[PDB]
C-alpha cells in the first residue's frame, strides 16, 4: 500500500561572485536553490551486494580467449552409457585454483555417443550445454550440468 510523497524546500542560493569577467556570457543565479525530496534509504535500498569485481574479472579473462576460438554447435543423442566424454577444468593462466575454469574435453569414450558422432574431440572447449554457459565455472558445476542432460543434448564447442 505504498504512497510516494513529494516536496520542495528552499536553501540559500549561490553567493554573488567577486568581479566576474565582462566577456563571460554565462552567469549564475543567486536565487534560493530548490531541494526536492527523493526516497529515504529505508524506502529505497540503494545498496547492491551482488557486485563482485574480482569474480567478474576472473570470468572475463577466460571469456576473452574463447572468442579467439571458432564456435560450432554439436547435438548428441544421450543413450544408456551417457555422453561418452570426460572433462577437465583449466584456469586462465598459471595456478588459478578451482573457481573460474574453462571446461575441456579430456576423454572421448571409444564407442560412446560423442565418439560415433565424430565431431567433439580431446581438448575441445565446452562453451554451452543445454543452454547453460560453462565458460568460467567450477568443474563440479560442469559435471552437474552434464549429468542432468537428457535425450538430444545441444552443445556449443570451441577448438584451439
Amino acid at each position: 500500500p505504498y504512497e510516494p510523497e513529494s516536496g520542495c524546500v528552499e536553501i540559500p542560493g549561490l553567493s554573488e561572485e567577486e568581479d566576474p569577467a565582462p566577456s563571460r556570457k554565462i552567469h549564475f543565479s543567486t536565487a534560493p536553490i530548490q531541494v526536492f525530496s527523493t526516497y529515504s534509504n529505508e524506502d529505497y535500498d540503494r545498496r547492491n551486494e551482488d557486485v563482485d569485481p574480482m569474480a567478474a574479472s576472473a570470468e572475463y579473462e577466460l571469456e576473452k580467449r574463447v572468442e579467439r576460438l571458432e564456435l560450432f554447435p554439436v547435438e548428441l543423442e544421450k543413450d544408456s552409457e551417457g555422453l561418452g566424454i570426460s572433462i577437465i577444468g583449466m584456469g586462465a593462466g598459471a595456478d588459478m585454483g578451482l573457481e573460474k575454469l574453462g571446461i575441456f574435453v579430456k576423454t572421448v569414450t571409444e564407442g560412446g555417443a560423442a565418439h560415433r558422432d565424430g565431431r567433439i574431440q580431446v581438448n575441445d572447449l565446452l562453451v554451452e550445454v543445454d543452454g547453460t554457459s560453462l565458460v568460467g565455472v567450477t568443474q563440479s558445476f560442469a559435471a552437474s550440468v552434464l549429468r542432468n542432460t537428457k535425450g538430444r543434448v545441444r552443445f556449443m564447442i570451441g577448438r584451439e
Binding site: 536553501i11 549564475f28 536553490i33 529505497y44 557486485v51 574479472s57 572475463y60
Partner: protein, 294 residues
Amino acid sequence: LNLDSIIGRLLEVQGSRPGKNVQLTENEIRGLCLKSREIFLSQPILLELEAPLKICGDIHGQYYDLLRLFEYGGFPPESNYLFLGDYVDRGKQSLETICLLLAYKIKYPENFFLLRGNHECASINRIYGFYDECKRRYNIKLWKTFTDCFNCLPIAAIVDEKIFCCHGGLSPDLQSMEQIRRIMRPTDVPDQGLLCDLLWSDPDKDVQGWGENDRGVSFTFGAEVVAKFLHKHDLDLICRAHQVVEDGYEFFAKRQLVTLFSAPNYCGEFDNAGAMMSVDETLMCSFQILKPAD
C-alpha cells in the same frame, strides 16, 4: 518498435515501492538498442546544443532516483535534457534506467541527449554490474547488443558555444575540437589517449598542470589547465560528472568547472544528494537538488 507502450510500462512503477522491476521483452530492448544506435550515429560525436537545457550527471542504475529527477525537473519533452553518462553499473536497475533513457532519445531525438560515460564501455560494465544484470535478467547476447549501442554514443557537447560538457574531463592531448570530431564510431574506449581522458580524468586542486590519477587510468588536471582551456576556446564553463559530490554539484577553479552527480546516496555507500543544472535562454545557470528524505 512499440515505443509508447514501452514508455508506459517503464513509467507504470512511478507509484510503487522502489525496487520493483519492469521486465520488458528481449525483442523490445533490442529494438531500443538498434534504433537509438542509428540515431547516435546520425548526430555528431561532438554535440552542438542550445539552451534551454537541464544537465544531469551519473545515474548508475538507480532507476527510482531517475524517475524522481524527471518528476521534479519535468518529464521529456517538458524540458530538454543532456545526460553526462554512467547510466549503468553499481545500481540494481541499470536495465530500466538505460531503457527509459534510450526510449526518450528515440521519441525526442532533437530535444534529448546522452553522452558516453566510462561505464558505457564493455571492459568496465563487464566488471561493475551491468553484465551481471543482463545475464541474470536476460542473456549475454543482450549485453553485447548494449555494447554495440554504447560504442556509438557521442563523447562531448558544447552548449551555446560556451559550456563544454563531457563525463570525465580534459585531456593533455586536447588542443582542437576537431580531434573529438574526427573520432569514428562505433569505437571502444582505449586504455589511454584523448577518448580515455574525456571519460576518465578528474580535476585536482592540489596539482599544478597534469598529474597521475589515483584511479589507475588517465590524469588529473589543475585549475590553471582549466583557465587556459576556456580562454583558448572562448568557453565559459566545463560541466562534467564522474565524481561523487556531497551536494550533487561542486565548483572547481572558482566557477570555471562544475561537477554534477545525479545518483543520491550513491549505491547506499555515500550520503550525498544528486543535482541537475538548468541553463536558461539567457545562459543563466541554476541548480536543483535531489535529497533523500530522513
